[model samples]
Target: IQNQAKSVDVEYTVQFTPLNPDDDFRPGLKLTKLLKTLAIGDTITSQELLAQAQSILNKNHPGYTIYERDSSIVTHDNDIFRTILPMDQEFTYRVKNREQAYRINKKSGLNEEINNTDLISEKYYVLKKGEKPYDPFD
Candidate 1:
């Protein structure tokens, strides 16, 4: 008999909402929505995703640019993004620092450093999200 395939639980919920409340629900522009289509544990290169993120912005978003800021992805922006969909939550990836990671400061709108002991890895994989953000403080 052939070897049986291993089974794993990978159920998760992903939310897609506008950064600005007034903006319409532009599902095509949300990267997480796009990512949700991938099979659980699938790997996608950061380079490819960054390129596609910018492409969506160029095609949609403003369609007109008044302010200097554009809705495109950059290296720093991608770094912050990885934190939100971090190893212990929605995805797993090789991080620069194995002992720590970034977290968003909603009030300051800045990337804050935090102790994330679960960042040790060499490859990126699509994982499942829990009912809430993984809180280690407790």
Candidate 2:
């Protein structure tokens, strides 16, 4: 018998930009509309959100897959979450799926959906200082 896969939950807050050209949404208006459907204070499993994102992307832009990771899967620097700063403000949205983490902030107006992994990686490095090397013999 196969073991049941454990569910993972993650808290995520997103910022969106207004309709201004300088602060417009990345990946276009369709994605912005989709993101707006999210709600705060809702707990979702990783698998659920990934499916939604995948479906949306496939419908709009076939052959495109939205890469996702569970909360337990740590990315570079720190946990995938350490890169996000906690904001003092708050917003709300309804829960959709297990992987769909949600947070609404006025700042969401400034957030853009990153479409490229290379860009995300580049931006992450620019925004944060590189981690220090550990001394194994110390």
Candidate 3:
């Protein structure tokens, strides 16, 4: 039998350093709205969220690459859990003018165009009844 559960809330944080102002800018209204709309157990995938978030960031901060942080599952209510997947790292371009759109070649340290093949395609964390969520500390 399939274990069913209601959708859970989602929360995340945006990180940026002052030294890398243009590369790691703060989240804008559109990105905020996007995050607010996500409810785990829903249809949205983590990859889709990142792709859109990256797109939103590039609109104003161009060429800044987004990096993902692993998600954590937290229990707040009886059988109710929340997912936290923060966008923690922002990879900056070595070139001075990233406004034209160019990402760093991690292997070669060169600037190049964004590659579609690099995107992720994973589902968001989900929880079901009779199954205990994995706890790394335990």
Candidate 4:
């Protein structure tokens, strides 16, 4: 099951807006992290993917608290997406149907959506000491 499958890098970013109103929510006040999933094939279910994904996050975060309640996901700049959808189901369908996974935003009082795409501006993705600013997806 593993030998014939393809290889892809799965990058997930989790950003949270701190509860402390004084927190800038721009710098250290917020929490952001990434996991580069390897050896992922097409047959993996979303359930297993989440389990492994959490494993990857646990190393950096110590505790994966992003997938919880009271943390509404921000859609655009103003719209707060509070609906709780089963992420497992969403991903399961997406993978089985050959679709890309949508960016997951859990419920949080964040004023804006966290865009981890920036490099020169403000972002939380990992970078080398001498690595030049480059597209995060690269």
Candidate 5:
């Protein structure tokens, strides 16, 4: 069933961003490694993920509050949470393939072909590694 109204059991890729300079977190190795680990089908409830965010509140991108983005299907008990990081991210090399709209070839058997208008993105993002956290203004 299409879980358009409630958060369903959908996996998501988690990412981080070092939005601040003084806040030395993402530039380090721990957060980066953690991001890579969760890149593949990190299935968890939104509240659970939010809990995780709470746990890591002390160690993350400075001023970059990790929150749920897609909340159309938010549930309290088992609602699938949104991405762990913000959507607006810098195109860092550490991140993988993330072309919102690209080209693709279509092949057909005999004379049958398929459509390609509804391609959902599986990639997520954190801030780039070089942003350098800890700004006074932040």
Candidate 6:
């Protein structure tokens, strides 16, 4: 028997801005390698990944606070908490996939897609007061 539960609609979006103008700062080599190492359907050990990521962040971006979320505590709908924190600089990474939408819908058990809009990826930089937002690469 299916469990029927009350549902609510939720929507989320992320904007990823290019920090280094010379290139799109998608996860660097180390991150790419680590993500690639994950086996399909295989769970990543949070502690291990966080330790590695923190190490990289320390070596690469000194003085920046680096962190990883415990997926259990941070739900999928909370894009800001998931993507925005780990990243350095003011850029954002948008979640743009039906699969992601599906997961979010499933979590809330929403009958229909709240926002069945095509996901768009965008990048933005938030400038602090009195600080100029300039492309570091340029």
Best-fitting candidate, scored by lDDT: 3
Candidate 4 local Cα displacement, residue 101, angstroms = 14
- Give the per-residue lDDT of model 2 (tens digit) for 1-138: 132112222332222222222322353342122222223234434344444445544564443333323122212112244232122222122232223222345666554322111001101000011322235634
Error of 2 at 39 (Å): 9.2
Better of 1 and 4 by TM-score: 4
Clashing pairs in 6: 15-92, 16-92, 16-122, 16-123, 17-123
> What RMSD does each model have against the real structure?
19.4, 17.6, 21.7, 17.6, 13.3, 13.5
Sequence-dependent TM-score of model 6: 0.25
What TM-score does candidate 2 get on C-alpha atoms? 0.25
Which tens-of-lDDT digit does each residue in 29-131 have in candidate 1? 3233223222223444444444444444445443422111112221212234333333222333322222224679999999876433221112221112222
The pairs that clash in candidate 4 are: 71-107, 71-108, 72-107, 72-108, 73-106, 73-107
Model 5 lDDT, residue 133, Cα: 39
Candidate 5 residue 39 Cα shift, in angstroms, is: 20
What lDDT is obtained when candidate 4 is compared to the true structure?
0.31
The digit string of per-residue lDDT tens for model 4 on 1-138 reads 322223233333344322222232355433333333233233333454445434544564452223422221212112232222243233331211112223444576434323221100111222222333435655
C-alpha local distance difference test of each model: 0.31, 0.28, 0.34, 0.31, 0.31, 0.32
TM-score preference between candidates 1 and 2, better one: 2
Query: Which window of ten consecutive residues has the lowest lDDT sum in model 4?
Result: 115-124
Please list the residue runs of candidate 2 whose C-alpha ends up more than 4 Å from where it truly belongs after superposition.
1-42, 68-138
**Cα lDDT tens digits for candidate 3, 12-111:** 3333222222324444522223133222233444455556556544564454444333432232223233333343433221111111224689899997
Relative to the unseen true structure, what is the Cα RMSD of model 2?
A: 17.6
Error of 3 at 85 (Å): 4.8
Clash statistics: count for each candidate: 0, 14, 0, 6, 12, 5
